[PDB]
Amino acid sequence: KKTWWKEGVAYQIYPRSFMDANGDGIGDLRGIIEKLDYLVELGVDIVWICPIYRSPNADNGYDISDYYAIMDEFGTMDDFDELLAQAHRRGLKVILDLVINHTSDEHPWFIESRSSRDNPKRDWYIWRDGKDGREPNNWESIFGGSAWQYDERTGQYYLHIFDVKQPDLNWENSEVRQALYEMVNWWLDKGIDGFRIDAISHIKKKPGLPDLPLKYVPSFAGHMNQPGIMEYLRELKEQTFARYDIMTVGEANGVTVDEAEQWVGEENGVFNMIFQFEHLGLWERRASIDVRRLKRTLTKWQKGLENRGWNALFLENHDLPRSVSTWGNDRDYWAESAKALGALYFFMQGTPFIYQGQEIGMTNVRFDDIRDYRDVSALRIIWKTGRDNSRTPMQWSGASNAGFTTGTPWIKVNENYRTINVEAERRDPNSVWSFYRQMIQLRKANELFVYGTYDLLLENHPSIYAYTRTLGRDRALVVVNLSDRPSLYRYDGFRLQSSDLALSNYPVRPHKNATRFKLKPYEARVYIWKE
Amino acid sequence: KKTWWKEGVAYQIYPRSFMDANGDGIGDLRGIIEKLDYLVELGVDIVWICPIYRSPNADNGYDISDYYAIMDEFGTMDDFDELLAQAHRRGLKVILDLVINHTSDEHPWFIESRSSRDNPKRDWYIWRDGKDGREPNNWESIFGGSAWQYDERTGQYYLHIFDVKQPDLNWENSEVRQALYEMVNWWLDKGIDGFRIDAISHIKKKPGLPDLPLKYVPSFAGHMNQPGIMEYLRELKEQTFARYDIMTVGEANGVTVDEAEQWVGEENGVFNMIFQFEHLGLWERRASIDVRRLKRTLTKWQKGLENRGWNALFLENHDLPRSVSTWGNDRDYWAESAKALGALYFFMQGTPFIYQGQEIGMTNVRFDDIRDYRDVSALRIIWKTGRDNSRTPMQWSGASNAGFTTGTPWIKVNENYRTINVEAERRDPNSVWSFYRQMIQLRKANELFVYGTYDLLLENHPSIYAYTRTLGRDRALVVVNLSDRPSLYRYDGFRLQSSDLALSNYPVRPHKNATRFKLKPYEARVYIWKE
Ligand SMILES: [Ca+2]
Ligand SMILES: [Ca+2]
């Protein structure tokens, strides 16, 4: 089954740090509009814009106070309508986040709900009396502490799996579901091309909210992927998504490759593709990431969803440090490792996602003062694992503040922008950006990277990650040396010819009938041929 | 200087528990309108309505999100306009709370302020960088913890003397002051007759917000009654209050009787009258409140503000337990003590305030289940000192829920409403209500209780609190036996005649030339004569 979403390349935008069109230091919608030509030039075709809905912003915008309104600092609904029009003119698809497990406590529905024990919206959230001076149950919040928050307006507590300011919607209530489907369809009718569904795995709560088998106990057994969830998700799909030509992206949170077919299966699957995070975070050993464990994790998803679902491929996001600075080497092999990592995940079976700046090799930021950081998490290892590493402003040129703003950025631009920036990288044919553009060009010109089946080679090799892609008589070999030291590639399965080398991060060296060769640090090669 | 505010009797309404006109269990504005005739019948003429402004209600409505709007559960601005019209038709004055030291963090001004380090409203609040990973200074919040709250949107902290959801307004900023005066005048032009000013003693912060001489240190030395505060308060008065015929009521928080003249002095005094709280809370001894300490506390204000200011007299409010249940005896001498307490504070020099239910002798509520309580404070002694004691619904009749609502009250009615309720008390000429009505009648018919000077008698007596009121040849003696056991009144200063007894809570017994007599438990007498 051939589809645009399987064949597309997605680009993830964190609006606040992408492009500031009005000089107030905050990226906005007009900023994005100014960069649609850039997205086209790069080659991507699906644009995922992180939360832009009205929000008190207590939870990086995932605490929505109005689903039908744009966050003031990003612009107006007119700006958004204009964005879709301009994006569609260019052949681009636009998807937004769908956060429907909860709303902000400042959402008008919760404000009415919390006012009294009997108002039309009381049942829209999860209210319960406590147990003699204590919370309704022993459930802990994913955000630490009780999942219950006492409310003095009524004497009862409301459930909040996430932040205190994120009360959970009562999916048991048909009125809630219907209001949510009307909201989804409103966006779909407005013209968006799909959504990235967030935390929907918690919409179904265990039937009497009983104590779980300890101040507060991690509560996943009472609200995550609970039986009956599929009833809500299938209804969500039939009432909304199924009525349009869109794409939905989910996450395999607490979902094994086997249970993932119920979420992303092509016939009866709530979502079209899914992200998995089992590969996130890999500390280096004495001698130097654990490539074999990476091969295993990524390979089970490749083989596991083959003809059963579709993988959403990625290395970066707004909640992670930069890939070149974590998986690669930003000190000695900056460009090489960035390109290597890019070839590695980009060419697998699935739809690749490029996070803003990943295509130019943005790295972690190392501010000396804790005050230059933002995310409350850091303030409470920052240089290496911090979320801000992916939230510093996008590096467009060597201009003041990397061309991001004419004002003062809400967070400082990484000092390496004079070198790492779009303008300079597009002039350099050996830049990380140019490598990315060639990768996008390769995948578009060779559908074997889209529908070809993945097969891992040299599984036990400690440094080389090599895999093939097969579609009929069309084959390709993606070989990557994930280490800062050379490595011998040795595989008597096929003879590699230099005329078949479609892409490499190192110059194409002469070689005929090669079954072995030394790979330079972070050397990555992509061979394509036809048997 | 004779004025309506000095001659009036004020009645304090806690809107949420006064009268529910629409059956949702929450008192509202229409409820108040239905009871204006009642207020007239009782005899009061100034109506103080507690916070009714739009508020996320995180701080009992003192966290205002919109000063130009009414809290949804209380009604609409039309209801409020109608309330003023109906109140004024009846000759009643209406005052509201003025909370201008801070606003809610959900107030549109703070939402703009917190968005970026440079927006027109950034300076409207108190933002500062922290000190290497910690708060800008060591200041503690009146509400425990740091007076600073980190905000991840900018990396800076905002000052909040009160709750986290109550960021402090920057009085240093003339734009803030001007916006506040426009707001005050808007209300004054709408027709209100004055305000009860709340926490304004904190508007002036010490000039560089330095550390005070310990996790966090109580911070009163950095923001309370700080030099320069009078500059703001005098400007507030000239730009607003001085342009209308209204009354302003303040509080002597951290203000001695000597410093109080600068706040309530008649020529240059920011407020017309002031509440003092030095008398609040008096535990009983082995044998039984400390009447002498009460005599001293109340007497310094009486003599201290004589010809220098004006006292706002009271025994109850929404933050206190009921007076009969704390100062009196609600078990054996319920009615006697209620009337005694009433005569005691009511007839002093100043403007008396009657809190809703005080006039019928409402008592503390003793719910067995902590769940029937509301104020978060209780949940964190409740039967005796709880705030809810004054927030249970007003007792109008012996009807379902005391006639307060036709629905389910937001908090339960005290089980004693079948007896303690307006309907029943108005039928009973020996009820606490009837006593209150006679007290109001007495004060209106004898201006000596308004402008007459107060003088304490028998200061060293352990149980009897006796004082006189003198205006020219018109004199009165208010004598009260504050104890559940009889007491001998003995004073050779004047001979009391039974024909001069204007009011008593016990039958008028025959006596001529009495310089001594035994007073029954909680017996209170008010003699009026002309020398
Ligand atoms: Ca902007
Ligand atoms: Ca009501």
Q: How far apart are CA A57 and CA B152, in angstroms?
A: 9
Distances (CA, A) of A437 to A39, A499, A500, B10, B257: 10, 21, 19, 77, 79
* Burial class of residue B481, CB neighbours in 10 A (0-12, 13-18, 19+): buried
Contacts of A210 (CB under 8 A, 6+ apart): A137, A222
Q: How far apart are CA A274 and CA B1, in angstroms?
A: 79
Kindly provide the resolution of this structure in angstroms, with one decimal.
2.0
Q: Identify the bridge partners of residue A529 per DSSP, sorted by sequence position.
A: A475
Instruction: Take residue A356 and report the two structure tokens written for it.
Output: 């803003």
Contacts of A327 (CB under 8 A, 6+ apart): A282, A289, A315, A337, A341, A482
Q: How far apart are CA B57 and CA B35, in angstroms?
A: 25
Ligand with the closest atom to the CA of A75: 1
Q: How far apart are CA A464 and CA A145, in angstroms?
A: 44
- CA of B29 from ligand 2 middle (Å) equals 8
Cα of A351 to nearest chain B Cα, Å: 32
Experimental method of this PDB entry = X-ray
Q: Hey, which residues of B are catalytic here?
A: 198, 251
Is residue A501 domain-shared with residue A399, that is, in the same domain?
Answer: no
For B39-67, give one letter per residue: b (16+ CB within 10 A) or e.
beebbbbbbbbbbbbbbbbbbbbbbbbbb
Is residue B212 domain-shared with residue B121, that is, in the same domain?
Answer: no
Residue (of A475, A322, A335) closest to A385 by Cα position: A322
Residue with tokens 């960069």: A35
Instruction: Take residue B18 and report the two structure tokens written for it.
Output: 């006064």
Residue B340 near residue B327 (C-beta atoms within 8 A): no
Instruction: Tell how strand A53-54 and strand B351-355 pair up.
Output: unpaired
Contact B155 A372 (CB under 8 A): yes
Long-range contacts of A500-506 (CB under 8 A, 24+ apart): A500/A527, A500/A528, A500/A529, A501/A525, A501/A526, A501/A527, A502/A442, A502/A446, A502/A476, A502/A526, A502/A527, A502/A528, A503/A343, A503/A435, A503/A438, A503/A439, A503/A442, A505/A335, A505/A336, A505/A339, A505/A340, A505/A343, A505/A435, A506/A336
Q: What residue type is A443 in one-letter code? A: R
Q: A73: which chain B residues are within 8 Å (Cβ-Cβ)?
A: 115-116
Q: How far apart are CA B327 and CA B282, in angstroms?
A: 7
Cα of A423 to nearest chain B Cα, Å: 28
H helix intervals, A240-290: 261-264
Residue A273 near residue A247 (C-beta atoms within 8 A): yes
Is residue A144 domain-shared with residue A193, that is, in the same domain?
Answer: no
Angle at A489 between CA A487 and CA A492, to 5 degrees: 160
Is residue B331 domain-shared with residue B472, that is, in the same domain?
Answer: no
Contact A26 B73 (CB under 8 A): no
Last residue of a domain, one of B152, B172, B192: B172
Is residue B148 domain-shared with residue B231, that is, in the same domain?
Answer: no
Distances (CA, A) of B65 to A112, A452, B175: 16, 57, 18
Is B24 among the annotated ligand-binding positions?
Answer: yes
For B441-461, give one letter per residue: b (16+ CB within 10 A) or e.
ebbeebebbbbbebbebbeeb
Residue B464 phi/psi, 5-degree rounding, is: -90, 130
Cα of B411 to nearest chain A Cα, Å: 7
Contact B24 A119 (CB under 8 A): yes
Q: How far apart are CA A146 and CA A22, in angstroms?
A: 41
Instruction: Take residue B43 and report the two structure tokens written for it.
Output: 């005899």
The shortest CB-CB distance from A408 to any of B118, B152, B369 is to B118
H helix intervals, B26-173: 29-34, 36-42, 77-89, 108-115
Q: How far apart are CA A224 and CA B199, in angstroms?
A: 46
Choice among A79, A105, A251, A388 that is catalytic: A251
Domain with A112, as residue range(s), is 101-172
Is residue A54 domain-shared with residue A127, that is, in the same domain?
Answer: no
Task: Report every protein residue that has its C-beta within 5 angstroms of ion ligand 1.
Answer: A 20, 22, 24, 26, 28
Give the DSSP H/E element, type plus range, for residue A435.
helix A432-445
Contact B371 A57 (CB under 8 A): no
Find the CATH number of the domain harbouring B294: 3.20.20.80
Contact B374 A57 (CB under 8 A): no
Residue A265 phi/psi, 5-degree rounding, is: -50, 145
Last residue of a domain, one of A120, A150, A172: A172
* Burial class of residue A370, CB neighbours in 10 A (0-12, 13-18, 19+): middle
Residue (of B37, B64, B36, B34) closest to B52 by Cα position: B64
Residue (of A116, A224, A110) closest to A176 by Cα position: A110
Residue B276 near residue B311 (C-beta atoms within 8 A): yes
Residue contacts between A and B (CB atoms, under 8 Å)? 83
Instruction: Take residue A25 and report the two structure tokens written for it.
Output: 């230091």
Q: How far apart are CA A181 and CA A236, in angstroms?
A: 7
Is residue B108 domain-shared with residue B86, that is, in the same domain?
Answer: no
Instruction: Tell how strand B66-70 and strand B53-54 pair up.
Output: antiparallel
Instruction: Take residue A263 and report the two structure tokens written for it.
Output: 């979420």
3-state class of A238 per DSSP? helix
Contact A375 B152 (CB under 8 A): yes
Annotate A454-518 with DSSP letters as a single string. EEEESTT-SSEEEEEEEETTEEEEEEEE-SSS-EEEE-BTB-B-GGGEEEESS-----SSBSEEE
Q: What residue type is A21 in one-letter code? A: A
Q: How far apart are CA B1 and CA B6, in angstroms?
A: 9
Residue B350 near residue B312 (C-beta atoms within 8 A): yes
Ligand with the closest atom to the CA of B23: 2
- CA of A124 from ligand 2 middle (Å) equals 21
- CA of A356 from ligand 1 middle (Å) equals 17
Residue A32 near residue A73 (C-beta atoms within 8 A): no
Is residue A269 domain-shared with residue A135, that is, in the same domain?
Answer: no
Annotate A278-344 with DSSP letters as a single string. TT-----------HHHHHHHHHHHHHHTTTT--BEE-S--TTS--HHHHTS-SSSSHHHHHHHHHHH
Distances (CA, A) of A167 to A205, A331, B55, B69: 13, 44, 19, 26
Contacts of B523 (CB under 8 A, 6+ apart): B336, B340, B480, B481, B504, B505, B506
Contacts of B384 (CB under 8 A, 6+ apart): B321, B325, B326, B364
Angle at A84 between CA A83 and CA A90, to 5 degrees: 95
Q: How far apart are CA A528 and CA A530, in angstroms?
A: 7
Contact B152 A374 (CB under 8 A): yes
Q: Identify the bridge partners of residue B527 per DSSP, sorted by sequence position.
A: B477, B501
Residue B426 phi/psi, 5-degree rounding, is: -70, -20
Contact B116 A410 (CB under 8 A): yes
The number of C-alpha atoms within 13 Å of A342 and in the hemisphere containing its C-beta is 30
The shortest CB-CB distance from B376 to any of A26, A57, A152 is to A152
> In which region does residue A497 sit, left (phi positive, over 0), alpha (psi from -120 to 50) or beta (all else)?
beta
3-state class of B216 per DSSP? coil
Q: What residue type is B296 in one-letter code? A: R
Q: Does A251 qualify as catalytic in the annotation?
A: yes
Contacts of A405 (CB under 8 A, 6+ apart): A20, A23, A24, A25, A393
DSSP annotation of A258 reads T
> In which region does residue B290 sit, left (phi positive, over 0), alpha (psi from -120 to 50) or beta (all else)?
beta
> Quick one: closest CA in B to A150, which residue?
B376
Residue B348 near residue B6 (C-beta atoms within 8 A): no
Residue A413 near residue A393 (C-beta atoms within 8 A): yes
> In which region does residue B104 sit, left (phi positive, over 0), alpha (psi from -120 to 50) or beta (all else)?
beta
The number of C-alpha atoms within 13 Å of A196 and in the hemisphere containing its C-beta is 21
Is residue B150 domain-shared with residue B239, that is, in the same domain?
Answer: no
Residue B466 near residue B458 (C-beta atoms within 8 A): yes
3-state class of A63 per DSSP? coil
Residue (of B366, B360, B312) closest to B334 by Cα position: B360
3-state class of B354 per DSSP? strand
Is B20 among the annotated ligand-binding positions?
Answer: yes
Residue (of A299, A312, A295, A306) closest to A251 by Cα position: A312
Cα of A36 to nearest chain B Cα, Å: 26
Q: A371: which chain B residues are within 8 Å (Cβ-Cβ)?
A: 129-130, 132, 155
- CA of A402 from ligand 1 middle (Å) equals 15
> Quick one: closest CA in B to A107, which residue?
B56
Annotate B251-278 with DSSP letters as a single string. E-TT--TTTTHHHH-SSS-S-SEEE--T
Is residue A327 domain-shared with residue A265, that is, in the same domain?
Answer: yes
Angle at B270 between CA B267 and CA B274, to 5 degrees: 100
Is residue A93 domain-shared with residue A106, that is, in the same domain?
Answer: no
Q: How far apart are CA B19 and CA A213, in angstroms?
A: 46
3-state class of B47 per DSSP? strand
The angle that helices A229-239 and A174-190 make with each other, rounded to 10 degrees, is: 40
Last residue of a domain, one of A420, A452, A484: A452
Q: How far apart are CA A269 and CA B185, in angstroms?
A: 61
DSSP annotation of A155 reads T
Annotate B419-488 with DSSP letters as a single string. TSSHHHHHH-TTSHHHHHHHHHHHHHH-THHHHSEEEEESTT-SSEEEEEEEETTEEEEEEEE-SSS-EE
Annotate A373-414 with DSSP letters as a single string. --SHHHH--HHHH-GGGGTSPP---SSGGGGS-SS--SSPPP
- CA of B101 from ligand 2 middle (Å) equals 29
Find the CATH number of the domain harbouring B477: 2.60.40.1180
Please tell me the total number of residues recorded for chain A in this structure.
531
Ligand with the closest atom to the CA of A16: 1
Q: How many domains does chain B have?
A: 3
Instruction: Take residue A107 and report the two structure tokens written for it.
Output: 């959402």
Q: A380: which chain B residues are within 8 Å (Cβ-Cβ)?
A: none
DSSP annotation of B73 reads G
Q: Identify the bridge partners of residue A275 per DSSP, sorted by sequence position.
A: A251
Is residue A209 domain-shared with residue A122, that is, in the same domain?
Answer: no
- CA of A364 from ligand 1 middle (Å) equals 23
The angle that helices A432-445 and A334-346 make with each other, rounded to 10 degrees, is: 20
Q: How far apart are CA A511 and CA A498, in angstroms?
A: 6
Contacts of A308 (CB under 8 A, 6+ apart): A260, A261, A264, A265, A266
Residue A438 phi/psi, 5-degree rounding, is: -65, -40
For A429-444, give one letter per residue: b (16+ CB within 10 A) or e.
eebbbbbbbbbbebbe
